[PDB]
Design a protein around this ligand. Structure first.
Ligand SMILES: Nc1ncnc2c1ncn2[C@@H]1O[C@H](COP(=O)(O)OP(=O)(O)O)[C@@H](O)[C@H]1O
Ligand SMILES: Nc1ncnc2c1ncn2[C@@H]1O[C@H](COP(=O)(O)OP(=O)(O)O)[C@@H](O)[C@H]1O
Ligand SMILES: Nc1ncnc2c1ncn2[C@@H]1O[C@H](COP(=O)(O)OP(=O)(O)O)[C@@H](O)[C@H]1O
Ligand SMILES: Nc1ncnc2c1ncn2[C@@H]1O[C@H](COP(=O)(O)OP(=O)(O)O)[C@@H](O)[C@H]1O
Ligand SMILES: Nc1ncnc2c1ncn2[C@@H]1O[C@H](COP(=O)(O)OP(=O)(O)O)[C@@H](O)[C@H]1O
Lengths: 147, 152, 139, 152, 152, 153
């Protein structure tokens, strides 16, 4: 359980508003280990697969186009309960319901521009990780402290 | 439009005296709200009693006005989607002991009589407080750049 | 005297070794509590504080903070005892992962605070001073 | 009287647009200077040409006034010992590429035409800038509790 | 054209291990530079020997390569006016003891053998280092909204 | 060899404490990589302060300096690291805060030379004198951190 991994993606608005370092800092100071990190403009096919459970939803077409309008930071973090805690750190889906102290609570307002994505479960994490990262891009090392 | 709601935020004299003006403003800037009005003044007793007119019959009303008059305040107007209620969440609760960490009052103050900040509790009180503290000429209009990334 | 309530906060070795001492003290200063005691030591015979090896393996920063409801609010600022339910914005919510390797301790109650303060601090180490912003904190 | 020196500090439109108002204010508050005046406005073209009258024959003067008029600015007056000279040191240099890390311009901007902030370069120019931008009632007098620990 | 200059910035393994990645990135974001490339990897010894090829005859070369290979590094490309020279200024000096407070090396490290960050020293070095560490398809290309307020 | 075990004495003056800057100052030394060795909180007596500032006893500001340093509690610290004495002074700034640059403690947080919030040993000689004056040897704690492997080669 100490080696659980989650997928975190900084959406284009978050990149455009200069929030990459702030977001990464919150995961670092929390104690989670950085495993994968890349910067890319996600293709429309990749995004449709990423949000496949929401294709019939009314906001899907605009969601895929907005996630394609700019580059994203794709990340993998490792640690105990990182999936659930990552979701807690992110906030709620609607930033209006995200508490102060959370990433979405502190830094954004509207649900269509909520700066960050996080996996909802281990099953979604393993699917998102293998979708966004090849296995050789995931680094394994012993981060300090921890123990 | 919904993305044009406005609220009134005031940094109370204890928040100014303790050097919290920048910290408070920064929270509204980084959240994505747009600064519309900003002034710095020592509010008169008449202005404060009209501001707190719904509390005229509370036992703490006289002490409230005297403390709000004991020093300068920062009066502000912030604009954005749901800015009134979201502003209240960012401030915390009336009693800072009920304000959770991460809120302005939860992080920076202790006692209900010195809660450093005020925020409009409703849209109707907001426009009432805005017009009370600001003239229409003092409210600035500008399209910031990141609104394409703040709103759809 | 209401505003004169005191609590005992201890930074455990993981907090010290991860460089969080100043960050933790800052959260109490910016909140408005008054620093009363502050010392640095490797603790032995910790069998009185608890009712032991990890607290003896390294250094502990022991503090005494004063203010209205400092015991209750101090525990709010630390976060829940498990870091998995601790909210972002709290000390444990921001910096802590698991329960065993905890970074910080805070007094459970006023009665516990009085006991822990008397055990860890001599009376000569508790400094009384009037801070300037305390009349802007209290009514 | 030396501890009562005042300077004029203005956050330019790019500074407001990029959300640096609270950050800039925080640096002056944490330094120990006293906030005296604070207002938010879109400066008229006459006010800006008067503000930059010593540069009217420069090739960039026209673009400077237009850019300064392109958005709202935050006008400020700060008080303290050597606040004019120290204010310039905290801002950095005219070209952000010459501004050192730790200063406002060094930390936050890149090119001279977009250097987010203005500060008076002398007591004389500060006196003129403060009168040009502020009315006398907009300057607030108060004693902060910090001053006994800031000045001997 | 000048505003499209690019530099290579690497966070060294000690910087990654001490939890400084976000701090370092934030200094480049808040300054106004545009992130162009970003990757996380454990660099091979041959990559590291080519990167520091001008130092192959230095007595510390073997220890430098081993240390740079002992953990994963964060590789980055940043774009902006004078980003190469300004990146050096933000980094500090080779010896952290000569790096001023406010710089990355001056704030965050102590020993020359563990100075947490690398940055290109020249435009020629940056072009060599960028193509050494990145492939062209990894260099992302976009119009940051916050760019009409950074550049004239 | 033991160059990384050099120690300095840093004291947060009463104005630094009263203005709520204790956490800010400690953080700068922590994030730099220096190791906290000693830490205490006390209202230093006049006899202690006069010994601490003995080289200044004939200066015009000596009596005011001792009185102000006694008017409230100070945070006394010992920090350890390579060249921590000289580097600590750089992190502090100059005697006059008006000559202290942004990014330094005195440059960011204070204004006047008489209220410069912090003290730091000006030499290795001064440091061992100041450390023993304010601290007994059993108050100096020993530990090694995970970061030491990444701060020093
Ligand atoms: N009502 C909506 N309008 C526009 N976009 C939405 C709406 N609801 C969700 N989205 C977008 O779809 C993304 C995925 O939503 P979902 O997976 O249900 O929540 P979460 O973001 O917590 O995983 C969100 O990040 C958001 O940007
Ligand atoms: N019991 C009390 N004693 C002293 N002051 C109080 C008390 N209750 C409220 N106040 C002050 O009156 C102000 C207005 O009260 P109210 O509008 O009910 O709270 P809020 O400001 O959270 O909306 C508060 O900001 C607080 O500073
Ligand atoms: N060569 C230039 N190109 C574009 N803008 C300039 C140039 N020189 C100065 N400016 C702008 O005009 C303002 C006033 O210039 P000056 O008073 O000399 O600098 P400072 O504001 O640092 O005192 C500057 O802050 C800068 O924004
Ligand atoms: N004297 C030295 N001893 C050990 N390592 C060194 C020494 N000089 C340089 N290095 C290492 O080699 C790297 C490259 O050296 P150089 O290119 O001269 O410095 P810079 O990184 O400042 O451009 C440095 O960042 C440092 O980590
Ligand atoms: N001219 C002065 N007036 C008042 N106090 C002073 C003056 N010069 C120095 N002091 C105080 O005495 C302390 C010791 O001075 P000194 O050791 O020479 O400087 P530093 O503290 O930078 O080493 C200073 O930190 C300062 O607080």
């Amino acid at each position: 359980a100490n080696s659980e991994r989650t997928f975190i993606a900084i959406k284009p608005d978050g990149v455009q508003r200069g929030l990459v370092g702030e977001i990464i800092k919150r995961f670092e100071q929390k104690g989670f280990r950085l495993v994968g990190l890349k910067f890319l403009q996600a293709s429309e096919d990749l995004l449709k697969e990423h949000y496949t459970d929401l294709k019939d939803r009314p906001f899907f077409t605009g969601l895929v186009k907005y996630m394609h309008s700019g580059p994203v930071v794709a990340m993998v973090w490792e640690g105990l309960n990182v999936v659930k805690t990552g979701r807690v750190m992110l906030g709620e889906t609607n930033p209006a319901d995200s508490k102060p102290g959370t990433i979405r609570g502190d830094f954004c307002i509207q649900v269509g521009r909520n700066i960050i994505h996080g996996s909802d479960s281990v099953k979604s994490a393993e699917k998102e990780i293998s979708l966004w990262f090849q296995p050789e891009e995931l680094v394994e090392y012993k981060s300090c402290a921890q123990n």
